[PDB]
Amino acid sequence: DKRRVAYFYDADVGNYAYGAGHPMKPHRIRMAHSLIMNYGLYKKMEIYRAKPATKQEMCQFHTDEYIDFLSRVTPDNLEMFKRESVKFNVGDDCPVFDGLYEYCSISGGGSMEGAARLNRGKCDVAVNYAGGLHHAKKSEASGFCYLNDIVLGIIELLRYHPRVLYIDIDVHHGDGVEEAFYTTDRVMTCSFHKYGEFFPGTGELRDIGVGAGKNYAVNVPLRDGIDDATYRSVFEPVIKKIMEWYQPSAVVLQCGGDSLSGDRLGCFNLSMEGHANCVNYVKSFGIPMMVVGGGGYTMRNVARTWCFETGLLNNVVLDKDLPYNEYYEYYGPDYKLSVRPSNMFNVNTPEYLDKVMTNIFANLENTK
Amino acid sequence: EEVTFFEKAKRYIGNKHLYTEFLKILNLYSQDILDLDDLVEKVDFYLGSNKELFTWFKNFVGYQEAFGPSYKRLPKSDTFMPCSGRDDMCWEVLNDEWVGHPVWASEDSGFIAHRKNQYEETLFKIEEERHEYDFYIESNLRTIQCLETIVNKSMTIYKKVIRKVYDKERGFEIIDALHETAPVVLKRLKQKDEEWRRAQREWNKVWRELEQKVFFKSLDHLGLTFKQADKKLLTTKQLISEISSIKVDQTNKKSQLDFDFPDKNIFYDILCLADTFITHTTAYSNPDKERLKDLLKYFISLFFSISFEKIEESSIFNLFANTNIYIFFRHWTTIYERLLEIKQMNERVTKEINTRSTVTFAKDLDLLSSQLSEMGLDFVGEDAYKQVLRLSRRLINGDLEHQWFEESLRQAYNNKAFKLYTIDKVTQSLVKHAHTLMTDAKTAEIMALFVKDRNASTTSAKDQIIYRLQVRSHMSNTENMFRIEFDKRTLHVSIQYIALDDL
Amino acid sequence: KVSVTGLPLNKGPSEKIKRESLWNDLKTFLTENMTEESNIRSTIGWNEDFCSACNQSGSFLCCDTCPKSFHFLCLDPPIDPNNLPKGDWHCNECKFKIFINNSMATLKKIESNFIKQNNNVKIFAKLLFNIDSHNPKQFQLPNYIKETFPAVKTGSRGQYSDENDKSYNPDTHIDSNSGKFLICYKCNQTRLGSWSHPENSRLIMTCDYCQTPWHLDCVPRASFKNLGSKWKCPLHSPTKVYKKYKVWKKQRLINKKNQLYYEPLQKIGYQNNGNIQIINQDFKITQIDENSIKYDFFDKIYKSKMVQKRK
Amino acid sequence: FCSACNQSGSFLCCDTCPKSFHFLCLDPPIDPNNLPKGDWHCNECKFKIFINNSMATLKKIESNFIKQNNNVKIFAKLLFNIDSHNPKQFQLPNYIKNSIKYDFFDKIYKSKMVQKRKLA
Amino acid sequence: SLQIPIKLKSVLVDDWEYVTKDKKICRLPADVTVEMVLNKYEHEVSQELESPGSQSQLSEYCAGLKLYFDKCLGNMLLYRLERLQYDELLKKSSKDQKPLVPIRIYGAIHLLRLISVLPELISSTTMDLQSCQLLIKQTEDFLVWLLMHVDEYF
Amino acid sequence: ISLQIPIKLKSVLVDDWEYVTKDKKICRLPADVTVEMVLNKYEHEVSQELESPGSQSQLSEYCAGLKLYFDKCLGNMLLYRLERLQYDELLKKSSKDQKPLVPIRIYGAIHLLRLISVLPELISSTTMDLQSCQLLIKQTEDFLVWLLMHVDEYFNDKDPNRSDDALYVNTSSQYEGVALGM
Ligand SMILES: [Zn+2]
Ligand SMILES: [Zn+2]
Ligand SMILES: [Zn+2]
Ligand SMILES: [Zn+2]
Ligand SMILES: [Zn+2]
Ligand SMILES: [Zn+2]
Ligand SMILES: [Zn+2]
C-alpha cells in the first residue's frame, strides 16, 4: 500500500498517573514511543503534537455539567463534590488524580487532529495511542475512561465521509462508542469481546441496533483462552463481509492490548503476531484508517505490540532484538520483541463460532 | 395422518413435564394470544431436532424492530441536556434515548474476575514498583529540565513535584515564591534525582533476579495444576466412562476408540524407560524384574509385530480382554501419544534452540542466566527429543529433581511439553499394570489364548466366536469385555466396548 | 516515607528482599526537535449506622436529641446537602415532644383539632393529627398482601424477589443421582471428551427449572449462569407475550386457600387465557384437558384455512 | 292437595314432609291398592337423606356424575338436578299464554368432506 | 332467555287447548318420533359445518337432548289428563319385559314443549355464563330448523 | 384491623413493588388521571345513584378526608426510596414558581391504592372508636369494589420501551446514582 503515516505524541502524557495500585497507567505510551524512536521509525513517519481539546470541543458529545465538573474536580476538593461524584461515577470506580483534565484534553485533541488530517487528505494513516477511551458515555466515567475521544474523532470524520466503520479488538465491549451511534447508520460499530460475567455487561449477539441504526452494530461474544488461529478465523470473514456490504469511507481501529496473553484483567491468549494480524488485515483494504490504542495493563507487552504494529503500518517488519531504549530493564529475560502465549485451554469450539458468524451474516444482509 | 401428530410428538418428546408445556403453548396459540411465528419457534425448540415432523407441522399450520436485552428507553423529558458545542449533524447522528449501563446488564449482581496464579502476581508487583520509581524519576527530571531552561536564560507537573519533595506542607509557600528561589529547588531536585537513581539501580538488580526465575512459571497454566489432575483422571473408572459415553452417543443415533501409530521408535523409547524403572525400582525381586522385562518385550513384539531381535538390542487380528489388559493398553497408548506429540516438533524446536539469537547491547554484556546452562539443561545441540528422553531417564533414576526437569522443559518447549511432567509416575503405573497381568490366573489364561490366536495366523470364522466364548468362560458374568483390533497394513487399533452384549 | 516497596524510596537493597529474591535508529532526544504543531482542526475556530426511614447505609444527617440518623433525601421535605440547614436540627418526633407533648393535656389538643375538623371531616381528623408526630418512613406493603402470593419474598434491602432470583472436568456430564450420563436434549449426546483430547468435549448446563440438560453450543450461549437470575431452558411457556400492541401476562401464584379452581362443562370451545391446568372470582384456573386442546388447535387450523381460501 | 296438579281428590300422604300426592301423578305411577307396606318417600326428601347421610360429603356426587356422563357433558348439570324434583303437571311458561380416536377421526372426516364440497 | 317464534307459540297454545279443554289425546307412537327428527337434524345440518369442534358440539347436544328427554317426559312434560295413558304404556312395558325408549314413542309435539321451559331449568342450576349461552344458541338453531320444516312434521 | 382488598388490586400493588424496587422504574408524573380526578369521578358516579342525604353527606366527607390524608401523608409514608428524588425535583419546580405542591393533582390512582393499604395500621395506631372504624372500613371496601370495577381504565400494562404514554418510565444512571447512593 505504501501509505503516509501521521503519528501523534505529547511528551507530557506520561507524567500523569492514577492511584498507586491502579492498573491503568499512561506510562506505557511513553514506553511505546521510546521503542518507536529507537527503531528508527521517525524517518518514515510525520510526528505531530496535537493542540489539546477545549471544553467546547469536548461538549460536542458530553454534557456541559459533566465537562464542567471534570475541569474543576481535584483530589483536594473532592469532599465539596458529593452529588456530582455519584452523578458522574468519578469517585471510587474511576478515581480523581492531579492531571485528569489535561490528560483528557491531550487524548481528545490527538484523536480530533488525526481525524482532521485524514479529512484534509494530508495522510492516509493517523496514529494516536493516547486515545482509545471507549467506555465513557456523555455524562459519566466508566472503565477508567473519562472522555470518549473516539466519538469526537468519528464526529470530526463524519463531516467529510458518509459512512465510518469502527473496529474494536479489546476484550471489553465498546459500550460508549456503540451507545453513541446506536441509532444511526452513518457509523457502524463492530466489537470482538469476551461476553459473560465480564465488566461491560453488554455486547450480546442480539444488540444489532435501534431505529435507523438497526443492523449497524455487530457484536462477537467470545470465550476465554482464544488464540491467534481462531481469532483470525473469526476476525477476517466478519470484517471482510462488513467491508463488502457496508463499504465504509474511513475506518477507526481501537488496538487495545487487553486481548494479549498475560494481561492482568484480560482472559485471552493472543500473541503479538495474532494481535497485529488484525491491524495488517484492516490496513490491506486501502481505505483511510485511524489507529488508537485503548486498554492494556501489562506495559512491557502492550508497548512492544504497539511498536510492532506501528512498524507494520510503515510497511516494515521490525527485528526481534530490542534497540536498547531507555526502559530496557522492563523487557524480561530475552529482551526480545515478542509476546509469548500461554498454554491455557481454548473453550471456543468451532460450532459456537459457526453459529455466531451465521447470525452475524444473516443480520448483515440489510446493510448494502 | 393429522390424527396421529399428537401421539407422535408425545413419543418424541419423551417426558410428561415437557409435553405439558407443549400443550400449554398450543393452547396459548388457540386463544389468539400467540402469533404463528412464536408458535413455530417454540415447536422448533421442541421438535426441531427431528426433520420430518417439524416440516409436516410447518406445512400443516401454513407457516409459509427487534429490541436487544441490554438497552432501555429513557423518557423524552430526560433527553434534552445542554451540550454547548453540539451541532445539527451532531444532534442528528448521536443517540440520546437508548441507554445500556452495564450495572443493569449485570442483573445487579456483579462480575466474575479471572483467576491469576501467584507468579503473575509477583510479576505485577515488580511492574508496579518499576512504574512507581520510573514515574517519580521522570517527573522530577522533567521539572529539573524546565527549571534549568528558566534559570539559564504543563501546569500541575511542577507543582506536584515540589509538593512531593517538600512534605512539610510548607511546599505551597515554595510554589508561591517560585511564582515571584529557582536555584534552591534546582539543587534540591538534582540531589533527589541522584539518590532515587541509585536506589533504582539496586532495585533493578533485585527485580531482575526475582523475575528471571518466575517468568516461565507465570505462563504455565495447564502445567501447574497438571500433576494432580493426571492422577485423578488416569484411573480405570475415567477410561471406562469415556468408552461408555462414546458407545452411548453412538447408540443414540464397533469402533468406539481409534488409534493410529505413525512411528515405531517411540515404542523402543517407552521400552527403554520401562526397563530403566524396572532396574531402578526397589519394589520387585530380582526374578520379577526379568519377568516384567520379558512380558513387556514379548507383548510389544507380538501385538504390533515390530521385531524380536533389534527390539532387544537398541489379515486383521482381534484380542478379547478384560479390564486389566485394556488399562495396560491405554497406559501404553498414553505414553506413546505424549512422546509422539513432543517428537513431531523436533525439527522446529531444535532449529529454534540452536538458532536462538541474543541481544548484544546489554543482554550478552550484563543480563543473562547461566542457571540452566550450569547443569546442561539448555538443549544446545543435543537433539531435543533425545535430550528429553535422557532427562526423563535421569528423573526416573532419581539424580534429577522435578523442579529443574520441569524448568528445562518449560524453557525449551515454550510450555508446550507440560504433559511429560508425570512420565516417571506413568511409567511406574504401566509397570504395575504389567505386573498385575502376571500375578492373576484369569488374565494369564486370557493372555495365553491371545498368544495362541495371534500365533495361529490361519483361522476360520469360528475364531471370532469360540475364542470369545472361551475368554468369557475364563471371565466373569457381570463385568465388561473389550475387543482390541489390530491392522498391520496401516498399524491401526480399534477398541470396542462389549460390556455384556456377548452373553 | 513509605512506598510500594515498603521502603522510604531512598534505601534500595533491603537485605531480606535480597535474600528472598536472588540466587546467591537514534535515541528519543530528537523528539523535541521534530514535532510540528498540528492545529488544522475544523472546530479550532471556536448514631445508628442505618437510615431511620429506609434502614440502609450511606451518608446521614444525624439528630442530637435521639440516636437516629436520616438520609438527606429520606426526609420530608428533602434537604440538599450543599445547602446545609446550619443550625440545631431535630426530627419531627423530637420537635413534637420538646414543644407540644404535654401528656396531661394532649388529649384536649387532639379534641380541639377534632372539633375544628368536625365541620368538614371527622373520620380522618384523628388520623390527620396523628401524622405530625411521625418521622418519614419508606413505604412497604403491609405484610398481608405479600403473603397472598407464595412466590414473592423480600430481599435484604427490601426489594422485590421472586422464584427467578437464585480445565477438563468430566464429572459434570454425570447425573450423580443414578450414575447415568446427562444427555443433551438438542443433540442426544453427552460429548464427554477424553483426557487425551479435552478439546473434544462440550460444556453442559442442566437447566434449573425442569432439570433438562443442554449444551452451551446447542442453545446459543457463551458462558454459564452463576450470579444473575436462574437459567431457564427454551422449553418453557413465555408467561409474558406482546401480540401485535397488546400485552398478555400470566396470573401470579395464589396461596391454595384462595386459589379457586373450576372445570367447564363446554369442553370444546371455551375462551380462557393462558391460565389453565391440564388434567375474588377473577383468578379462576380453568381445567382444560388434552382432548379439548387438540380440538381447539384443529378448529383454529381449519378455520384459518377457510379464511385464507375464501380470498 | 296433590302437589303435581294442585287439585283435590284421593291423595297419598307423606311422613317426613307434610305433602300429599296422587297415585297416578307419580313417576313411576303406583297402583292405588298396591300400598308400599312400609316406608315410602317422594323424589324429594329421599335425595336429601341420600346426600346428607349415606355418601360422604356435599358437592362430591355432582362431580362424580359429571365425570361419569362426560359423553353428554353440557347437560350433565341438568341431568343431575332432574332426579331431585317431584313430578308436576306441564304448566305453560307463562309467557306463551379407544372410543375417543374414532370420534376424532369421524369429526375430521366429515369436516373435510364439507370443506372439499364447499370449495368446489 | 330463549327466542321462541310466534308460530311455535301458536302451536303450543293449540295443543294446550286441544288437550285441556276438548280432551283429545293423540294416538300411541306416531309416524315421526323425537328420535327420527333428531337424527335427521344431526344428519342434514352436519353436512354444512366445516369445523370439527362444531360437529362435536352438535353431536353432544343431540345426544344430551335425547338423554334429557328420556328422564323428563314423565316428570314434568305431561298434562294430568294424559298421565293415565302414560301409566298404561308403563304397564305394557312392564308386561312385555321390553325396555322403554321414550324417544321413539312421543314425537315432534312433545319435543317442542321440551325446549319451551329450558331457561327456567337452566336458571335453577349452577352453570357458568359461557356454557348456557352455547346451549341457548344450539336450542335457537334447532328451533329455527324445526320452524323451517313445519308443514311435514306438525 | 382487617381490610378486604380484591385480589386483582393486590396483584397491581405487587406489580408496582416489582417495577419500583427491581426494574428501577418510576411513575410518569404528572399523572394523566390524578387522585383528585379519581375521587371526583367516584363521588359523582356513586352519589347520583343513592338518594338518602344521610348516606350522601358521608360519601362527600369520606372523599374530602381521603384527599386531605393523601395530601398530608404522601411525602411521609407513600413513596419508595427511589421515588423520593423525583419528589424533591417536583418540590423544586413548585418552589421556583411560588406555587405550593398539591400532590392530589400530580400523583394518581396507584399512590391512592397504596394509600388505602396501610389504613388498618394507621387506624390501629390511634385512639379511634369502634363504629367509626367500622364506617371507615365499609366506605373503603365500597370504594375498592368501585375501583375494581373500573380497573382496566386506571391500570393499563404498556411497556415504557414501546409506548410514550405508559404509567411507568425508566430511570437514568445519573438519577439512580443520586437516588440510591447519596
Ligand atoms: Zn478494555
Ligand atoms: Zn434512607
Ligand atoms: Zn431526633
Ligand atoms: Zn447438545
Ligand atoms: Zn427447563
Ligand atoms: Zn295430580
Ligand atoms: Zn316426604
Numbering used by the authors:
A (entry chain B): 17 to 384
B (entry chain A): 664 to 727, 749 to 837, 859 to 885, 890 to 962, 972 to 1032, 1134 to 1322
C (entry chain D): 107 to 130, 166 to 187, 259 to 378, 400 to 477, 489 to 523, 534 to 565
D (entry chain F): 262 to 358, 545 to 567
E (entry chain E): 221 to 374
F (entry chain C): 220 to 401
Give the text the authors published on this PDB structure.
The Rpd3 small (Rpd3S) complex recognizes histone H3 trimethylation on lysine 36 (H3K36me3) and deacetylates histones H3 and H4 at multiple sites across transcribed regions. The Rpd3S histone deacetylase (HDAC) complex recognizes H3K36me3 at coding regions and suppresses transcription from cryptic promoters via its deacetylase activity in yeast. Here we solved the cryo-electron microscopy structures of Saccharomyces cerevisiae Rpd3S in its free and H3K36me3 nucleosome-bound states. We demonstrated a unique architecture of Rpd3S, in which two copies of Eaf3–Rco1 heterodimers are asymmetrically assembled with Rpd3 and Sin3 to form a catalytic core complex.
For structural analysis, we co-expressed full-length S. cerevisiae Rpd3, Sin3, Rco1, Eaf3 and Ume1 in a baculovirus–insect cell system and successfully reconstituted the Rpd3S holo-enzyme. Next, we performed single-particle cryo-EM analysis and acquired an overall structural map of Rpd3S at 3.2 Å resolution. Using a focused refinement strategy, we obtained 2.7 Å and 3.2 Å maps of two local regions, the head–bridge–right arm and the left arm of the Rpd3S complex, which enabled de novo model building of approximately 1,800 residues of Rpd3S components with high accuracy. In the structural model, we identified one copy of Rpd3 and Sin3, and two copies of Eaf3 and Rco1. The modelled structure contains residues 664–1322 of Sin3, 17–384 of Rpd3, 220–401 of Eaf3-A, 221–374 of Eaf3-B, 107–565 of Rco1-A and 262–358 of Rco1-B, which constitute a catalytic core complex with Rpd3 positioned at the centre. Although Ume1 exists as a stoichiometric component of Rpd3S, its map is missing. Cross-linking mass spectrometry (XL-MS) further confirmed the existence of Ume1, which mainly interacts with the C-terminal tail of Sin3. Both the Sin3 C-terminal tail and Ume1 are invisible in the map, suggesting their flexible disposition. The two highly integrated MRG–PHD1–MID modules constitute the right and left arms of the Rpd3S complex, which use distinct surfaces for asymmetric Rpd3S assembly. Rpd3 is wrapped around by discrete regions of Sin3, Rco1-A and Eaf3-A, including HID-N, loopS, four-helix-finger (FHF) and HID-C of Sin3 HID domain, PHD1 and PHD2 fingers of Rco1-A, and a C-terminal helix tail (αE) of Eaf3-A from the front surface, as well as an extended α–β-coil (αβC) motif of Rco1-A from the back surface. In the Rpd3S complex, we observed that a long α-helix of Sin3 (α1) within the FHF motif covers the basic surface of Rpd3 and inserts two Glu fingers (Glu811 and Glu812) into the inositol phosphate-binding pocket.
